[PDB]
PDB file of C-alpha atoms and ligand atoms in Angstrom:
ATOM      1  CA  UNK N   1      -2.087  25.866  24.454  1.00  0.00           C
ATOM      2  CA  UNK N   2      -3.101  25.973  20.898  1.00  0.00           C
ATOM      3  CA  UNK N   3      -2.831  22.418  18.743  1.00  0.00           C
ATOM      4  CA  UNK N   4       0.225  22.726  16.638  1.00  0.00           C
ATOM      5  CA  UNK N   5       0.181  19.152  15.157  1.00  0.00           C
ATOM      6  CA  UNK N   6       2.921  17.913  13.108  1.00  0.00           C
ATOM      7  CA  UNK N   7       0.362  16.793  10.040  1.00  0.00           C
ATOM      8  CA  UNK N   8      -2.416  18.864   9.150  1.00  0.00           C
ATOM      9  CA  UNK N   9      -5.511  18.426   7.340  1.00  0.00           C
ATOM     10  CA  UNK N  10      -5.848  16.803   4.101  1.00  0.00           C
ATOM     11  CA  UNK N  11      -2.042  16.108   4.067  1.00  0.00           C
ATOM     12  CA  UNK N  12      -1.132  12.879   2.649  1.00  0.00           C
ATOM     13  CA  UNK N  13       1.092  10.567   5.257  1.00  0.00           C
ATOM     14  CA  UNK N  14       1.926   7.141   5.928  1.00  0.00           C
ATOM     15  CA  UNK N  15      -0.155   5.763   8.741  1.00  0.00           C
ATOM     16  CA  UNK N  16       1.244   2.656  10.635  1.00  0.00           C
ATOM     17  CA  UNK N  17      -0.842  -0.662  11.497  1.00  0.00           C
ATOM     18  CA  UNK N  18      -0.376  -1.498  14.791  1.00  0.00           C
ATOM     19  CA  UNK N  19      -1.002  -5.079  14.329  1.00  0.00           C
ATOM     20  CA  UNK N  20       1.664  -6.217  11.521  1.00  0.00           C
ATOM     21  CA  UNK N  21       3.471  -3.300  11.738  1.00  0.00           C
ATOM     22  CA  UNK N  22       3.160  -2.016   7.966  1.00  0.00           C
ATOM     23  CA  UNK N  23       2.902   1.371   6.736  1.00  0.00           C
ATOM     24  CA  UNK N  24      -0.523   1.987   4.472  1.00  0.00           C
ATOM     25  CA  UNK N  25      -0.748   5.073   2.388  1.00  0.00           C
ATOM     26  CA  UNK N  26      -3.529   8.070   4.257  1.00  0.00           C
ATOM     27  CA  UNK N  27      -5.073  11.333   4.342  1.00  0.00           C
ATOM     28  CA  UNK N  28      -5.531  13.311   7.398  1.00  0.00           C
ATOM     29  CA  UNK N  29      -9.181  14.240   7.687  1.00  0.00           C
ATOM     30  CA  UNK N  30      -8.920  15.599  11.196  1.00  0.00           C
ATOM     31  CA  UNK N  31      -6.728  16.336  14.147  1.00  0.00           C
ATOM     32  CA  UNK N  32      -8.065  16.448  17.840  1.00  0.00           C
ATOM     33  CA  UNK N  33      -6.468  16.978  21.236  1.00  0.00           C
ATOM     34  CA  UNK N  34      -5.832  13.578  23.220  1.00  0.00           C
ATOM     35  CA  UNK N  35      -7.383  13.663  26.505  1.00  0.00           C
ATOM     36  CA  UNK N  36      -4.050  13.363  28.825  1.00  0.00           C
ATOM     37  CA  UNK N  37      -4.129  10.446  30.657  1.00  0.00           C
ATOM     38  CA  UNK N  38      -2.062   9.058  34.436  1.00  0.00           C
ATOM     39  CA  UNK N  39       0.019   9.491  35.352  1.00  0.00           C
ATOM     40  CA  UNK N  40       2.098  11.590  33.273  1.00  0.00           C
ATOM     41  CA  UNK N  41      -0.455  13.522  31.549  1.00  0.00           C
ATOM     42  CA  UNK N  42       1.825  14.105  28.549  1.00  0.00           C
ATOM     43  CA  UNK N  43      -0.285  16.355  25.783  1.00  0.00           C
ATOM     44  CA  UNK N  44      -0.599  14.602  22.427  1.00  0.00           C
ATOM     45  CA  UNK N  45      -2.873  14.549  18.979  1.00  0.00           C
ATOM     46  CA  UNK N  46      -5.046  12.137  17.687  1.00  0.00           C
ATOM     47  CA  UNK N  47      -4.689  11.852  13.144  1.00  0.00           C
ATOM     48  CA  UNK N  48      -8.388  10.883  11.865  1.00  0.00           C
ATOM     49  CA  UNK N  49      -7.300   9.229   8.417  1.00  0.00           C
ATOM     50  CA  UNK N  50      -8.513   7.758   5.589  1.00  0.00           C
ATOM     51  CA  UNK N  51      -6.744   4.744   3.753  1.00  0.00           C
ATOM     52  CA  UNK N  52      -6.309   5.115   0.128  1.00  0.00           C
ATOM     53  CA  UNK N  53      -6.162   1.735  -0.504  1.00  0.00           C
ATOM     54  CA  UNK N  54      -8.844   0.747   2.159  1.00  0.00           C
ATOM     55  CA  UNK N  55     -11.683   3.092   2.079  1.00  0.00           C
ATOM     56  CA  UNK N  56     -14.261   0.455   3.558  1.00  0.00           C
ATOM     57  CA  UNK N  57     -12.364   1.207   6.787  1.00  0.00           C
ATOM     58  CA  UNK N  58     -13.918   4.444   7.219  1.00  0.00           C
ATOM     59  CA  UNK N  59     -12.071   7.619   9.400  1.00  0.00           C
ATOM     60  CA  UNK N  60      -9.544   5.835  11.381  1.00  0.00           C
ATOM     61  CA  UNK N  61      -8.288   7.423  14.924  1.00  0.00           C
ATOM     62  CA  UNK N  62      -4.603   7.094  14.793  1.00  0.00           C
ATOM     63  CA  UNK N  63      -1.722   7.670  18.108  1.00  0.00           C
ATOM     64  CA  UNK N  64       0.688  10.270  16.759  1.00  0.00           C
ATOM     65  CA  UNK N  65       3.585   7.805  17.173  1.00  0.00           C
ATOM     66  CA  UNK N  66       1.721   5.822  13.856  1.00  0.00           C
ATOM     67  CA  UNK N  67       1.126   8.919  11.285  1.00  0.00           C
ATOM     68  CA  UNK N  68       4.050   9.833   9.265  1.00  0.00           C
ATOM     69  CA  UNK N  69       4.743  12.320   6.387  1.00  0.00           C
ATOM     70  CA  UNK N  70       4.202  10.413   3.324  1.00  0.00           C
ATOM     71  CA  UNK N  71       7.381   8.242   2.093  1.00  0.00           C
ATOM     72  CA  UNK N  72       8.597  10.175  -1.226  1.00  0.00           C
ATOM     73  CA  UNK N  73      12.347  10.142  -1.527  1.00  0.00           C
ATOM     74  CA  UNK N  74      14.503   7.111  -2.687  1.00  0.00           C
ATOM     75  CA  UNK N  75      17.869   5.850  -1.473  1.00  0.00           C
ATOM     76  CA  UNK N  76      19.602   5.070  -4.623  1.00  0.00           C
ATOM     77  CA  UNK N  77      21.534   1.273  -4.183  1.00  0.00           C
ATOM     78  CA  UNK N  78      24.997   3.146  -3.777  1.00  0.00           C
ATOM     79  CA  UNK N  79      23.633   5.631  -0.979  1.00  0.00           C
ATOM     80  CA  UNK N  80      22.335   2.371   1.309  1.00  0.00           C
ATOM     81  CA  UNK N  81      24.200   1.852   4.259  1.00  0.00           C
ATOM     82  CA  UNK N  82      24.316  -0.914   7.220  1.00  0.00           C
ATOM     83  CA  UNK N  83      22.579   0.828   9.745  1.00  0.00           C
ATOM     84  CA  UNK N  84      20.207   3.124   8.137  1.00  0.00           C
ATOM     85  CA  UNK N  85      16.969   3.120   9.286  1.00  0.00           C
ATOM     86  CA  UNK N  86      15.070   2.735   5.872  1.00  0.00           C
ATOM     87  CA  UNK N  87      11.142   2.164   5.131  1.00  0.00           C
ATOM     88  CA  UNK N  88      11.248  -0.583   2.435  1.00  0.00           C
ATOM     89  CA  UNK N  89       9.198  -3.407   0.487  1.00  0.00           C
ATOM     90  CA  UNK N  90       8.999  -6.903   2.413  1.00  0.00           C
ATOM     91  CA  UNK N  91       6.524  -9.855   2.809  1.00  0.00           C
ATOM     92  CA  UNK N  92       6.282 -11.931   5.924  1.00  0.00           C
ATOM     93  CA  UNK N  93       4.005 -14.810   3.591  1.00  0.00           C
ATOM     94  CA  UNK N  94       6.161 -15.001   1.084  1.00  0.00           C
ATOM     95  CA  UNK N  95       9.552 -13.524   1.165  1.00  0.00           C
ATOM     96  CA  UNK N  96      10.652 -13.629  -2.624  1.00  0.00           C
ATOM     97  CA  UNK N  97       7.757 -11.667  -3.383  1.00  0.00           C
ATOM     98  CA  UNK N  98       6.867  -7.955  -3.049  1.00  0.00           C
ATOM     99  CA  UNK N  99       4.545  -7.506   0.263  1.00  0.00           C
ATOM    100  CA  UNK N 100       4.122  -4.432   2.213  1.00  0.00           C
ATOM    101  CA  UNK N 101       6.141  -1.152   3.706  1.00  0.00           C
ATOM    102  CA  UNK N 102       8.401  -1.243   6.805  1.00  0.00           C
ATOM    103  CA  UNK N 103      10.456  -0.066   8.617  1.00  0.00           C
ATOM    104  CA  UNK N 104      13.998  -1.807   8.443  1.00  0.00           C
ATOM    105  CA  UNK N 105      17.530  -1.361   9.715  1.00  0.00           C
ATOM    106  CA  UNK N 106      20.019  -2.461   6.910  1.00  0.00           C
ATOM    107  CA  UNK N 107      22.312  -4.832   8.207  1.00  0.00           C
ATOM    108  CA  UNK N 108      24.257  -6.338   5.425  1.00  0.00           C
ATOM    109  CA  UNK N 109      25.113  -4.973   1.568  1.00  0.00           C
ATOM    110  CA  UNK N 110      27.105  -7.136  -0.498  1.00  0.00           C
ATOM    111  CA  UNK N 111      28.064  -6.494  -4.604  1.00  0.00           C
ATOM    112  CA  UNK N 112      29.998  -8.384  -6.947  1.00  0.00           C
ATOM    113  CA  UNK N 113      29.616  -8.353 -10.821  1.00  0.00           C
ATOM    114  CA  UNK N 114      26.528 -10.655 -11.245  1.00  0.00           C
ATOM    115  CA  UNK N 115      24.437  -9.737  -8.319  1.00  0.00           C
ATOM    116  CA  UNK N 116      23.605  -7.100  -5.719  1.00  0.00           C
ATOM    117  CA  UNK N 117      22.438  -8.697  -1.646  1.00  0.00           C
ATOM    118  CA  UNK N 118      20.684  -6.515   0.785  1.00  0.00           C
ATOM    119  CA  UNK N 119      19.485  -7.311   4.095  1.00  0.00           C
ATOM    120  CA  UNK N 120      17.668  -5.628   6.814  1.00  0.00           C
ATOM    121  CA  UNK N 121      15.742  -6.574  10.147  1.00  0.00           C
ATOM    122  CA  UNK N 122      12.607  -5.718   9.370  1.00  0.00           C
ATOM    123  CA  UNK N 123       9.664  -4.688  12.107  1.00  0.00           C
ATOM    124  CA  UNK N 124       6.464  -6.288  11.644  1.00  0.00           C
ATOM    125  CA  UNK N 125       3.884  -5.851  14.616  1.00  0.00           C
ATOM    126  CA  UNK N 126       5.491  -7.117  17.862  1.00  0.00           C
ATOM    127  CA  UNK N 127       8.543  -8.192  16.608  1.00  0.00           C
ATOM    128  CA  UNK N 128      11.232  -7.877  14.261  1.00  0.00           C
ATOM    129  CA  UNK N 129      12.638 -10.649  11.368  1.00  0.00           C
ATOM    130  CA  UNK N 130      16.472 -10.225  11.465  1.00  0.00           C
ATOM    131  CA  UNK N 131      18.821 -10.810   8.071  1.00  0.00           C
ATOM    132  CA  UNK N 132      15.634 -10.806   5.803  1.00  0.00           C
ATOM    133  CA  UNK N 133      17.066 -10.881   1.693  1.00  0.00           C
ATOM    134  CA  UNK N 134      15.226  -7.791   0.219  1.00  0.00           C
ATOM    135  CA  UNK N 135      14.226  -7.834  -3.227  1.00  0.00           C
ATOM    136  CA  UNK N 136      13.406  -4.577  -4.194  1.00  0.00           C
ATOM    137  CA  UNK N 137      17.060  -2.905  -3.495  1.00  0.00           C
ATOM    138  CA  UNK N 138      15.786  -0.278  -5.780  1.00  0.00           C
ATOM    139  CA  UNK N 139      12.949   1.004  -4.153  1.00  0.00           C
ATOM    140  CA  UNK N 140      14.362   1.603  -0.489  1.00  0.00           C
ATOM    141  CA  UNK N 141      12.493   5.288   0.855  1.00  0.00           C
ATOM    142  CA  UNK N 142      13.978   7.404   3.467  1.00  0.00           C
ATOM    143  CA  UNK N 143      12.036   7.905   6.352  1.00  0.00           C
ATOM    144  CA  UNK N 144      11.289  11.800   6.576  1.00  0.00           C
ATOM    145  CA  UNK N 145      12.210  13.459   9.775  1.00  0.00           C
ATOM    146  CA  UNK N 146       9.261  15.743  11.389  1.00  0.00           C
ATOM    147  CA  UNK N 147       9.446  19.573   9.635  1.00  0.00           C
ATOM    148  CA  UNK N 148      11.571  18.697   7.014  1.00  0.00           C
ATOM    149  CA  UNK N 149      10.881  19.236   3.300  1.00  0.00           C
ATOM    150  CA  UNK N 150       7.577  20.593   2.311  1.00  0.00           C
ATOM    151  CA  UNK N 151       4.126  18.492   3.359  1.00  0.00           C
ATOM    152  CA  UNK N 152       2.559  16.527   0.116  1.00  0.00           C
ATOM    153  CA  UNK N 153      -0.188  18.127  -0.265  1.00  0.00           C
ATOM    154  CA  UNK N 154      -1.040  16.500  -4.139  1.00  0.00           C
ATOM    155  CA  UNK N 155       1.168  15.062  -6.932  1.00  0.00           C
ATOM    156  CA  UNK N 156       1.683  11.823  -4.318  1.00  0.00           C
ATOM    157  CA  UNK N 157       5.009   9.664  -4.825  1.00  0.00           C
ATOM    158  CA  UNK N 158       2.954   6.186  -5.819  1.00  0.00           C
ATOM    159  CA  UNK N 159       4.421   2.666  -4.178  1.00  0.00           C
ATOM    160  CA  UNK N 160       3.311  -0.556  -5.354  1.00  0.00           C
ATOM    161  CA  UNK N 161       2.425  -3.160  -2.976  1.00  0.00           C
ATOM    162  CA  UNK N 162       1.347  -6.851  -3.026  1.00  0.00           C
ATOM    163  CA  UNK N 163       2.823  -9.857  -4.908  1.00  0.00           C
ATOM    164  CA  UNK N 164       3.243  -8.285  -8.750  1.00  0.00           C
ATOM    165  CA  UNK N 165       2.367  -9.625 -11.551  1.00  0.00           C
ATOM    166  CA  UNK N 166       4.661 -12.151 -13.259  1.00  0.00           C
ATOM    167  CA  UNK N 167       4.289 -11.223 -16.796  1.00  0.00           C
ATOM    168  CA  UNK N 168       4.804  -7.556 -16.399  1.00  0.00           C
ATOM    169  CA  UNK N 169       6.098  -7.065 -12.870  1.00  0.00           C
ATOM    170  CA  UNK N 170       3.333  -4.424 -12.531  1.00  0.00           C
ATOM    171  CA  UNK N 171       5.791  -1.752 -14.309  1.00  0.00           C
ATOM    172  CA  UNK N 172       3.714   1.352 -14.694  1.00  0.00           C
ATOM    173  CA  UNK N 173       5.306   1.607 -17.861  1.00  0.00           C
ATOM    174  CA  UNK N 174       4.299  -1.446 -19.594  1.00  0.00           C
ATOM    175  CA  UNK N 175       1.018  -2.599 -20.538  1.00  0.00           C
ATOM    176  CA  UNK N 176      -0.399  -6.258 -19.877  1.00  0.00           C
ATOM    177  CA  UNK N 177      -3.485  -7.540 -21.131  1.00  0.00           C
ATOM    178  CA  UNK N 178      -3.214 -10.189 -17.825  1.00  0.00           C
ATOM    179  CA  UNK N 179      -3.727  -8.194 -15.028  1.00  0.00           C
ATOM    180  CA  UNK N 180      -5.034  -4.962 -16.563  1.00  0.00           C
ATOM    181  CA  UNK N 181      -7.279  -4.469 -19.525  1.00  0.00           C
ATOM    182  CA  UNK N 182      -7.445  -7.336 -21.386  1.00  0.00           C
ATOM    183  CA  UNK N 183      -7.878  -5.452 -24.681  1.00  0.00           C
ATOM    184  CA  UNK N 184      -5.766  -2.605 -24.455  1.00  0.00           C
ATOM    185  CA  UNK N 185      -3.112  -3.719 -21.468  1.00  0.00           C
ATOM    186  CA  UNK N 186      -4.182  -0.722 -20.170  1.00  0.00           C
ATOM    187  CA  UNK N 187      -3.782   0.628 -16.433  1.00  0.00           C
ATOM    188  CA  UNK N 188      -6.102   3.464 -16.551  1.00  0.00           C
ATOM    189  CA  UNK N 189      -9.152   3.728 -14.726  1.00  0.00           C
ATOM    190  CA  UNK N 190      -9.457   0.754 -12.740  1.00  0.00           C
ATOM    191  CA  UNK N 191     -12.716   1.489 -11.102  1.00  0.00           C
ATOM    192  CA  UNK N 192     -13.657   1.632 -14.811  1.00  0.00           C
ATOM    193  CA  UNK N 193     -12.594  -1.926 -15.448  1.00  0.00           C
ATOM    194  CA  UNK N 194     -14.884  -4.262 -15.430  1.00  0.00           C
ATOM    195  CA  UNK N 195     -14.102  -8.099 -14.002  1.00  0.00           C
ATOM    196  CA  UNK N 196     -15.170 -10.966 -16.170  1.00  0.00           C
ATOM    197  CA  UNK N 197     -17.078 -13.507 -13.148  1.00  0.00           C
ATOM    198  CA  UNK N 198     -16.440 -16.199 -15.520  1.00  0.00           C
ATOM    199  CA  UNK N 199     -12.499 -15.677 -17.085  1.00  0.00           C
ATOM    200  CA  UNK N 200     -11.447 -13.124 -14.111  1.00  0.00           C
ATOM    201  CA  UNK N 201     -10.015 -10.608 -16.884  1.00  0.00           C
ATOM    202  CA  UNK N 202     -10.531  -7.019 -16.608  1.00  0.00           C
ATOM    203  CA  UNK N 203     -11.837  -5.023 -19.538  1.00  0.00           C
ATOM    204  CA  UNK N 204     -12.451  -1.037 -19.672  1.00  0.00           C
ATOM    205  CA  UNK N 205     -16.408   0.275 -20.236  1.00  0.00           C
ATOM    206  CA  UNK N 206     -14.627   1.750 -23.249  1.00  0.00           C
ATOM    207  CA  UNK N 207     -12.985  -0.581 -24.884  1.00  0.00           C
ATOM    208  CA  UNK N 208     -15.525  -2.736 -24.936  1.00  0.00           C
ATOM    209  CA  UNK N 209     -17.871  -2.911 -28.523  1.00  0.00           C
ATOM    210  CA  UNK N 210     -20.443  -1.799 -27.775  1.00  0.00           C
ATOM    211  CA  UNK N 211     -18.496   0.520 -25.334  1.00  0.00           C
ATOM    212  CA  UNK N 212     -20.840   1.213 -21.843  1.00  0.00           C
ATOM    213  CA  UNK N 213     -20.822   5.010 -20.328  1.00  0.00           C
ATOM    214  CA  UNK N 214     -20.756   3.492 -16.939  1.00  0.00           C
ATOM    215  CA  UNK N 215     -20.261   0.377 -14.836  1.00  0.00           C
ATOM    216  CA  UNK N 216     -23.516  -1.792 -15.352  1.00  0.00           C
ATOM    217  CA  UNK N 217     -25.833  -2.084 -12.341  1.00  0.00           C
ATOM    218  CA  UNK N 218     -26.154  -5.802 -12.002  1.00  0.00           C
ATOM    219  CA  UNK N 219     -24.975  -8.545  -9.563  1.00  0.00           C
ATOM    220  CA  UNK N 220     -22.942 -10.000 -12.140  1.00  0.00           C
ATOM    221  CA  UNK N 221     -21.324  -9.325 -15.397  1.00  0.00           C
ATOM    222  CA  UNK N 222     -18.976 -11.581 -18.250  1.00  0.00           C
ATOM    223  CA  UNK N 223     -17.157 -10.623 -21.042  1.00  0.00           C
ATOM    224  CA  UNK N 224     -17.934 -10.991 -24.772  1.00  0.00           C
ATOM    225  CA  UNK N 225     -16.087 -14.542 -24.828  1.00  0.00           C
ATOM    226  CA  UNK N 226     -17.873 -15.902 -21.791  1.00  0.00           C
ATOM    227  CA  UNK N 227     -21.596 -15.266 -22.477  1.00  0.00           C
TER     228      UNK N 227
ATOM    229  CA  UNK I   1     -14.158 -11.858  12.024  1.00  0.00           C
ATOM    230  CA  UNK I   2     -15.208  -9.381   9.998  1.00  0.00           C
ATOM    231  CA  UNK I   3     -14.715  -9.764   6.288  1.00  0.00           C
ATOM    232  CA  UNK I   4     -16.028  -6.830   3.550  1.00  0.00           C
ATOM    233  CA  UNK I   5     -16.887  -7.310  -0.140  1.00  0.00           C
ATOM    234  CA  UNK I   6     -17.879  -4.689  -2.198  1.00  0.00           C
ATOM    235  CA  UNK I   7     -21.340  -5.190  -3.821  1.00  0.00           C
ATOM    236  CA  UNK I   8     -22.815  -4.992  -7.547  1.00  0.00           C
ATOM    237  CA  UNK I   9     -20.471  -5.676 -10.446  1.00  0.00           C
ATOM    238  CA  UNK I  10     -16.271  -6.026  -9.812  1.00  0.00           C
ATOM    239  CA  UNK I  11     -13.726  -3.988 -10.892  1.00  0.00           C
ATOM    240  CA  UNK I  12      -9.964  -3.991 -11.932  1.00  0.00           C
ATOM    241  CA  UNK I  13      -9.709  -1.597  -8.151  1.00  0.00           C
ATOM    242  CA  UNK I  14     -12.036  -3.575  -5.758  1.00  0.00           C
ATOM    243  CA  UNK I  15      -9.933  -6.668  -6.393  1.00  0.00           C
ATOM    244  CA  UNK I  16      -6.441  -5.246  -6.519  1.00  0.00           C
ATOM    245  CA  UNK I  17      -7.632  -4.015  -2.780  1.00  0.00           C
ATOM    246  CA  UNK I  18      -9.317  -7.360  -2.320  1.00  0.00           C
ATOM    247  CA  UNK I  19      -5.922  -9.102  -2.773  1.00  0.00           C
ATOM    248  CA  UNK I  20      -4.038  -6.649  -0.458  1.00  0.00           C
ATOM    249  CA  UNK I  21      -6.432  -6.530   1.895  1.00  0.00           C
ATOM    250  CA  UNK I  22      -6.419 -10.573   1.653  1.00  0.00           C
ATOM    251  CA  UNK I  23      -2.557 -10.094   2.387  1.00  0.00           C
ATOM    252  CA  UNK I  24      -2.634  -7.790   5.384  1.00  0.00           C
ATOM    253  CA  UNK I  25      -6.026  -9.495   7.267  1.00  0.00           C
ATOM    254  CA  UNK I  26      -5.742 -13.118   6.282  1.00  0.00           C
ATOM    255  CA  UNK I  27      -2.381 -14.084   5.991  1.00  0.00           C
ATOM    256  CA  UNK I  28      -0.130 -11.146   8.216  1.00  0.00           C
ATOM    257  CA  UNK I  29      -1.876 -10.983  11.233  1.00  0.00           C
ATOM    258  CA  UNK I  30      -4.323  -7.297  10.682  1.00  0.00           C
ATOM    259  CA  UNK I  31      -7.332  -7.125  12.329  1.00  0.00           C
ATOM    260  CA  UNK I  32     -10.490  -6.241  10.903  1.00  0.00           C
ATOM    261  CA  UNK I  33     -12.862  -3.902  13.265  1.00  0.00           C
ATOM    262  CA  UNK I  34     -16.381  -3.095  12.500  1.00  0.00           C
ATOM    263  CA  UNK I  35     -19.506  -1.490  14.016  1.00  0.00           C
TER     264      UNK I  35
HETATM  265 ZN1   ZN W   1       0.624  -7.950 -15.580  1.00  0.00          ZN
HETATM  266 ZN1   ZN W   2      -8.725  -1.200 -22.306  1.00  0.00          ZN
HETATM  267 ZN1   ZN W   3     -14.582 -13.643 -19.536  1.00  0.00          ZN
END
């Protein structure tokens, strides 16, 4: 019959690595018919996707079972229950810190008046890390069931992963002249900011005096303070 | 082992990938294919 894929083209899902078990922000560039295979011969697509956040990688052939509709709806810290199945913020290196997205089954929620405890088994590649503290009890994302709500097709709900920041916790809201432009704090344009090889500081082509109209064509570049 | 690094001049975006990217290969157990 016809291919009647779940995801279609250029719709913006979570795709899941197979080896840690996190879920990376995609695009679906293409969906093709899986050649059935013994001894069931079960019918099934394969998602060609691109990785926002790791476009080196190239089109990547996904299973089915590892594409998702994109994450985009937040379970508010009084809606979390012991046993929902959540997708949520976690890292394996260093568990105080933020890391990556996966899937997690809550398994504890405690509140009193001076702090707020969640924890979840969490499912990394081949296994899963029972009782794990989560940090970020604030950002815990439903997992969308297949044909429900409408696919994101633009305006994408934005996660942040990776260990933050420690002088502005990488809050979209603030400006830091540490980790972002270190003129204007700035988080704009980031393939526009240029990185000092000397000081490791980022700086905008336009804040800079004189101000460049593109990144410079050089193996190298340092700031004003470092030449 | 396959390890990528994007040529020329670096900016703010090529290392706040190089540092997740550093996370997920590195330290958590991804694998890195390339052809
Ligand atoms: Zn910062
Ligand atoms: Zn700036
Ligand atoms: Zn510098």
């Amino acid at each position: 019959g016809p291919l009647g894929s779940l995801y279609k083209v250029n719709e913006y899902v979570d795709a899941r690595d197979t080896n840690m078990g996190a879920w990376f922000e995609a695009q679906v560039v293409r969906v093709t018919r899986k050649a059935p295979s013994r001894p069931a011969l079960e019918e099934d697509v394969i998602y060609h996707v691109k990785y926002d956040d790791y476009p080196e990688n190239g089109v990547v052939q996904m299973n089915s079972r590892d594409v998702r509709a994109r994450a985009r709806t937040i379970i508010k810290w009084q809606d979390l229950e012991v046993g929902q199945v959540v997708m949520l913020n976690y890292n394996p290196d260093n568990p105080k810190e933020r890391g990556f997205w996966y899937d997690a089954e809550i398994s504890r929620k405690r509140e009193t008046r001076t702090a707020r405890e969640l924890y979840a088994n969490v499912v990394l590649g081949d296994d899963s890390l029972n009782d794990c503290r989560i940090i970020f009890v604030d950002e815990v994302f439903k997992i969308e069931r297949p044909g429900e709500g409408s696919p994101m097709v633009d305006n994408p709900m934005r996660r942040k992963s990776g260990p933050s920041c420690k002088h502005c916790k990488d809050d979209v809201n603030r400006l830091c002249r540490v980790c972002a432009c270190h003129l204007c704090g700035g988080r704009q344009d980031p393939d526009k900011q240029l990185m000092c090889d000397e000081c490791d500081m980022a700086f905008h082509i336009y804040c800079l005096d004189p101000p460049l109209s593109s990144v410079p064509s050089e193996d190298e570049w340092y700031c004003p303070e470092c030449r | 082992e396959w390890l990528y690094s994007r040529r020329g001049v670096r900016t703010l975006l090529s290392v706040q990938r190089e540092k997740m990217a550093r996370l997920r290969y590195m330290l958590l157990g991804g694998v890195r294919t390339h052809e």
